[PDB]
Amino acid sequence: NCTSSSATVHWLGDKPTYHAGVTFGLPWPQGKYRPQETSFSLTGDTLQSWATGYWADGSLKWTAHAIAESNQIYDQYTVTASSLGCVKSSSSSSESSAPNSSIVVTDNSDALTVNTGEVAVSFPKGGNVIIGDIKTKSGKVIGANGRLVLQSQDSVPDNFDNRANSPIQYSNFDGNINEVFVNQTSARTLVTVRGNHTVTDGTDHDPWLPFVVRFYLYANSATIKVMHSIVFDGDENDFITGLGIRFDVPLKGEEYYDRHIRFAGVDGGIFNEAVQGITGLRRDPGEEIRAAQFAGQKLADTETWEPRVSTRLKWIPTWADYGLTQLTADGFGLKKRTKAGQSWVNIPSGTRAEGLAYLGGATQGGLAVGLRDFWKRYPVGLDISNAASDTGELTLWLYSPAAEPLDLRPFHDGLGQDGYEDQLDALEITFEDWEPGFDTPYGIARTSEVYLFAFDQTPTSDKLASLTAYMNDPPVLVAEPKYIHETQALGEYWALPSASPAAATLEDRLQFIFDFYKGQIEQRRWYGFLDYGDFMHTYDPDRHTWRYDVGGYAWDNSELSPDLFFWLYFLRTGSKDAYRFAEALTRHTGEVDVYHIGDWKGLGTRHGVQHWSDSAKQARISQPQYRKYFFYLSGGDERVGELLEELLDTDKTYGELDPQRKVRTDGWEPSPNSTVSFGLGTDWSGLAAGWLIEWERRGPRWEEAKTKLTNTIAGIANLTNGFVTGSGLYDPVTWTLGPPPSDPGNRGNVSISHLNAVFGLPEVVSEAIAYLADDIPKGFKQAWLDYCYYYHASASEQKDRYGVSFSKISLLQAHSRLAAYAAYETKNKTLALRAWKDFYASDGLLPDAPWNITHVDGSDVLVPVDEAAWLATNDIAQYGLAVIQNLAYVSDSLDDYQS
Amino acid sequence: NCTSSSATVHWLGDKPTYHAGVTFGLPWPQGKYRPQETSFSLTLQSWATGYWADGSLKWTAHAIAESNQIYDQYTVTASSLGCSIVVTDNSDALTVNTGEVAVSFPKGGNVIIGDIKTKSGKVIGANGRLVLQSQDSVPDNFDNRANSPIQYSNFDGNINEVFVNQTSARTLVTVRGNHTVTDGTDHDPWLPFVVRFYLYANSATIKVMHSIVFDGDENDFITGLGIRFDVPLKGEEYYDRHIRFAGVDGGIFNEAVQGITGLRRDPGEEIRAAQFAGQKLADTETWEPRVSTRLKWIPTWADYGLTQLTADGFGLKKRTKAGQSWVNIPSGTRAEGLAYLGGATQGGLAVGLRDFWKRYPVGLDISNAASDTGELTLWLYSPAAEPLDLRPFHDGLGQDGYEDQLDALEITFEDWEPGFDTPYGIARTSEVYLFAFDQTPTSDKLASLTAYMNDPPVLVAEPKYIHETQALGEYWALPGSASPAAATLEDRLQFIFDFYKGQIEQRRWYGFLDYGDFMHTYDPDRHTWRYDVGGYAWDNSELSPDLFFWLYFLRTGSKDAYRFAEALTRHTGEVDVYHIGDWKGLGTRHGVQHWSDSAKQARISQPQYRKYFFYLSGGDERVGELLEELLDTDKTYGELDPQRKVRTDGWEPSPNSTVSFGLGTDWSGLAAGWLIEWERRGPRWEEAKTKLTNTIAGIANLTNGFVTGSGLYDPVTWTLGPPPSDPGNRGNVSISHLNAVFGLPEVVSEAIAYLADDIPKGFKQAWLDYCYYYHASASEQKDRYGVSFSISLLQAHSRLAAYAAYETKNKTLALRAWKDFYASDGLLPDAPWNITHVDGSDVLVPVDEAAWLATNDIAQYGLAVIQNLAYVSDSLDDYQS
Ligand SMILES: C[C@@H]1O[C@@H](O)[C@H](O[C@H]2O[C@H](C(=O)O)[C@H](O[C@@H]3O[C@@H](C)[C@H](O)[C@@H](O)[C@H]3O[C@H]3OC(C(=O)O)=C[C@H](O)[C@H]3O)[C@H](O)[C@H]2O)[C@H](O)[C@H]1O
Ligand SMILES: C[C@@H]1O[C@@H](O)[C@H](O[C@H]2O[C@H](C(=O)O)[C@H](O[C@@H]3O[C@@H](C)[C@H](O)[C@@H](O[C@H]4OC(C(=O)O)=C[C@H](O)[C@H]4O)[C@H]3O)[C@H](O)[C@H]2O)[C@H](O)[C@H]1O
Ligand SMILES: [Ca+2]
Ligand SMILES: [Ca+2]
């Protein structure tokens, strides 16, 4: 007999005018549905399912779902879930369905084809071509020989004058395929292609700059979503200069006046030309034949037009190449030329190109290609080539050659810092912890969301403007905030927006903080091929910039869990903008700010002037927990899935590198075949986050990840001082966690750090406590409750319990949330009030702060800005978390405190 | 016995907050003041710029020194007979000294300013040098760079001649040369230059008119063009060395090598706020010692680069030193194009380029600020850009011989030919400024100076007085509207002026060579000017818009008008015209490129187009040079035939053997050029007057006169007789609608008035006839003449009928002039007369438009309004039936 429950999914924003199939996630109550013994139906007012994560007990926690492209787009989609008991007490009779369209593949020795019903595309299993051909339903080829291009240079000149005496040696590469994979379903098929960049033209090289590219194809869709990621493994002499994706468009049978070129301009504008310019000649071929060219239709046979024009094609020139380049965030240049050899002709251009180009004909068809958030990921470009020839070229430049080349070398020389002592003394003035050869981008990554669109004939510009919009704002379905909370499938430590007017203005300040930071991206132009998605760490109130050039006060690189603030803000609110902002952050931080290959695979790089400048390579930047929310909302984004998997090697890095090497007083140092020393707060919050997630996903290494998390949780519980213990040692063969170097025989150590609880520890711990349920090692929960309570007890209370008082605690507003927890967990209203007091009257932001922005115009600044010189990013992140977590755990004591 | 009058001069826009000396012109009525014996007092530097025929003063020029006292009006009194900068000259270099600044210019070498010095004797800048970089080839596309290695060559402007007009308030310093190689492909000297330095008494700002003629191959691709200076800054502590960049809309960027703001430790709110203000920071002893030690770990920012490679977006970047990466700097849209380098104690320099972001691609660099001497470059063309591709935009399309060329003309509207797609001999004048400071100034001063150069102030005469003097035309009068029909004409001129002024911004008519011009005709299907079909693209003065705009300013005094007209005349005079070689004096005709079209002609180069901007401004010395250049326009008619290819004869040109001129299409421009050199009394005036006054007399004795087609000009005797296919007179009658639209009625109108009683024969009739007869009845085109004409631009030629009507006193004609204006071709009173906005997927960027008009229409519509109102507004009331 039956268990069945429904859960509704809404468009992130407005009901979109078009979508090309979407994937969403739903959560489910702990203990309610067994996998593969639960079916899922869909009501849209008037469904392809799979599990992404499971509960402790093995029931479904998070699933993911996929709907085909449709012209029916509903205000809401409701997903019912019936168990097997439902269909197995029947004597009623379903009709059996049959979708109007449904994907079919052909797996092959040579290639692999995927037929959506509107296109068929081929995926070579080897070679230097990712997509062999893209076919309409007609059977005709619309684009083909899709390939990844990369150019480099060997050197870069000191300054412009120096070009004369320094020679740049250029070299070209082809994306070489090495594996192809498939996740086939009726509704959507993921094609994952992994490989390398290998040489073809210019100087010889090792194969390098790896890539994985994911092609997403939905039933009934000529749209193909492309998630292109590369790990960077260049060295001192590897300057990327172009990075791109190129397709051949046929055009062979096509009268030039019937071949059309389009680019997206600004605010949903389209550029509309053909290879041969019949509009605005001296002589007219007729209202209707001009009107039809502009509209991308096939023109009548030449014997129908006033022959003063028809007898004179030959003299009307023929435009082979077009070029859109976006090298700043504010202006794009656009040009064309007749053929390779002539000067180009400047076309009237504009500000911020929406980043799509189409190339085809009214008969031969064509494809279009584009990059989501195009101008925000400058320097980018869109190229057409050989449009007057037999086979045309259409290319998306992810990094335009027209730009200055990608320069990832260290921004300074070391400033003469010799040894650890100087390194730490640099940190006291610039807030940077430098080390020679740590200022490196070796192993960082970047993903880009690229769309391809196939066309039978030239589409209308209104259809082009639409797809261009589509791409830049890809429709997203998301579960209800209320329901995501009920399930408890994404943490206990947040809840929806109370009655207290104090609670009310706390929400208003979260919206202030958010509105500011969103506004501050545009105003400070936090855009760029690698930069976009991140923001900075502290303001310079004298200069009125953010501190882009002062060591650690520049790029924020997930310092004090801004990720958590913004994702928890989304979970509560359901705001589009909250998501869109957190999406962009998780895409940067997850990819740029963590090392994916190397001896540091697992670590991420602390805030710096570059995103890899600082020597602090630590787990608290890579921190899986920061990705956890977006993995599940989104329906297991398979890239972010890979990124969480990567991180399951973090623990190994403590054999290589100690983050305390410079400050550790107990002269420890790691050796091979020995126990390694990580932190019990910041370091372990990352390890344990990653181990929880693999356990939850039931991945290849789940039994392992489960084991490590339980052993380490018992270890901390068996330590003596628990988390107040500084930070023990860990055996990589036995996976157990023992006391630190200076306490061999649990006669407890004390090391306190204000950082230990602001990089996901509360979140990870609660989740883990919940997961292990009864199986939890005895006294872990107490050890954690201790840490929570004692942090901001009296100094006597601390001395009494721990020997010494906690002399270096700060971030009290930040830590207010640890009270709010232990308050809830112990049903102690005096400890609840500790939260509200430490939040309302200690450090961070404070209720009587300005809580407004000032405008700064005129000669003090390059360009007009708004500023709030009174807040820093560390302030807004931990404030935000405190607001959400204190309201979560102790709403009921807030009015009590106020009164 | 005394004759004294007065004449008042006004700022162009609002009263300026600040100027740096100003030169301005004043016209004077005919036969009023004798040169060398008429004194001038303000409430004053003076000199003659044009003279009347009887030698009396026609246009003067005047300079006032830089002054903190700045007044609303300035009044100059002229007085008949009846009633301070210091230059030194060592045997090496000349130095001008204004009171504030002292600049030394070498007489030779690859350095053009030696050093700049503040009254205190302190060197703030040094080694002013013209920079250039070229490359030999450009890749076809971006994949082509590993299989086509590119060889760069570096040059720097060698000096050849150095002239000095010195006076008390003002001191011009004119330095000619070309770019002599240093490192790179052993290249011959090329790219000749004229740089004019204006230095006024009192100022420490310098006006710098940098002119340059392109004289290079299909292989000479300019990557970078700069003006470069060394800032000393030796014993200035790092934290006391400042950097600025003007950004957007009165903004200024403000750092220093070695940041003391933004740090973990705070030295002291006073200290920080000094660095931001650009002041010498207090002793290290007064600092907080956690900041004052540790200075060795705070990095030093040597290099700074601001590129503006589009019209809407600039970048900004910094580098500790070369070898390390750059760090991106919060940037924005449209840099106003100044930069400062210098120090609190050591002082320093600031360079800037007027209209910086409009003349893209441009950069401003600062280098070696961590060193003992720092570089400060203004790049006039940015090495960051693609390298200036002056080649032809097509390979001819399979066109072989005149048959094809002319046939293509019937579809794409361009007259092609091989070898004529060449920019050899075009020029371009960039207006630069330099600013010398004893100490890093207030960044509110840098803002006001960046405002200074992007809108340098202008002192111009009263329109009522310029009309009264008759120094520029009698063919224009002030709006003073008395009918309802008049004011709607005035409104329409204002409609036209706005629409055009906006189209520059909307259609992005911006760029190194592009900025100043507009386009010819619109494409109503695409919603775009015809930027890619032959002669429908760049308008290169066709049908005399230069002549409409500069007239509109004369009448109004609108600052906008002046500025629009200015930037045009700064383009058409320089980039469309040829300055060296065989075609020197001919302008290329309207095309996709400014030099694409094979029809190189005199109608474009027409000196009348620059006449007004020359005299207003007080004889701009670069425009003065150009007006001379055009005196060798006639030399080109034994070198090229504008009527070849359209010629059914066997004829072919050689020098010193007679040629045919269209009396409007060719003569109007020569007459104009000659009448100017005469007016000015230049190195060739006597020549010019004889050539002009001959060719005038020549016409009056052609039996039919202007009604005869072309003339027969003898380069040896400088005379003009009847054309081939009519020797011995008897009579020729050949009419083209193109004659009266390219200057004719303004040159004839001015020459007649300039000559008075020395006017030959009945030239005045020979003119009057063509005016009356151009659109009389075909029956009256027998009664006189005997061969009924074959009529083409009637609204435009309405001006000519109006001229005759005033000169005759003939209201029959005046009413016909109005009936052609309102009821013939051209625009038409019932026309749409509004703009339509266009957006969505129909265009790239949203835009306004009127496809019911084109640039031909508006120019001749505009001239027609102004001239029919001036001559025959009386008849407008009476007309309205
Ligand atoms: C192990 C490793 O060691 C260093 O590489 C580095 O530690 C330094 O940076 C820390 C960090 O990045 O968070 C940290 O900083 C404090 O906390 C942050 C939030 C503040 O921005 C800092 O001002 C700093 O504050 C303390 O210092 C000050 C101050 O004004 O300087 C005032 C407060 O009262 C103090 O709490 C460490 O303290 C630094 O050693 C790595 O982070 C670390 O993991
Ligand atoms: C003689 C010499 O040779 C040619 O290379 C070229 O002539 C051609 O271009 C002219 C030009 O201005 O560029 C003229 O076009 C002339 O007048 C302008 C105002 C008009 O656009 C034309 O109107 C001709 O236009 C048409 C038409 O094509 O439908 C009909 C009208 O009645 C005409 O006014 C245009 O003729 C020449 O006519 C043209 O042959 C050089 O410019 C020329 O000096
Ligand atoms: Ca970052
Ligand atoms: Ca031009």
UniProtKB/TrEMBL annotation, chain B:
Q: Which Pfam families match?
A: PcRGLX_1st, PcRGLX_2nd, PcRGLX_3rd
Q: Which InterPro entries match?
A: PcRGLX/YetA-like, PcRGLX/YetA_2nd, PcRGLX/YetA_3rd, PcRGLX_1st
Residues in PcRGLX/YetA-like N-terminal RIFT barrel domain copies: 6-78
Q: Which residues form the PcRGLX/YetA-like central beta-sandwich domain?
A: 85-450
- Cite the entry's keywords alphabetically: Lyase, Signal
PcRGLX/YetA-like C-terminal alpha/alpha toroid domain span: 456-876
Signal recorded as keyword: yes
| GO terms of molecular function | lyase activity
Q: Which domain of life is it from?
A: Eukaryota
UniProt entry tagged with the keyword Mitochondrion = no
Q: What is this protein called?
A: Exo-rhamnogalacturonan lyase
Q: Which organism is it from?
A: Penicillium chrysogenum
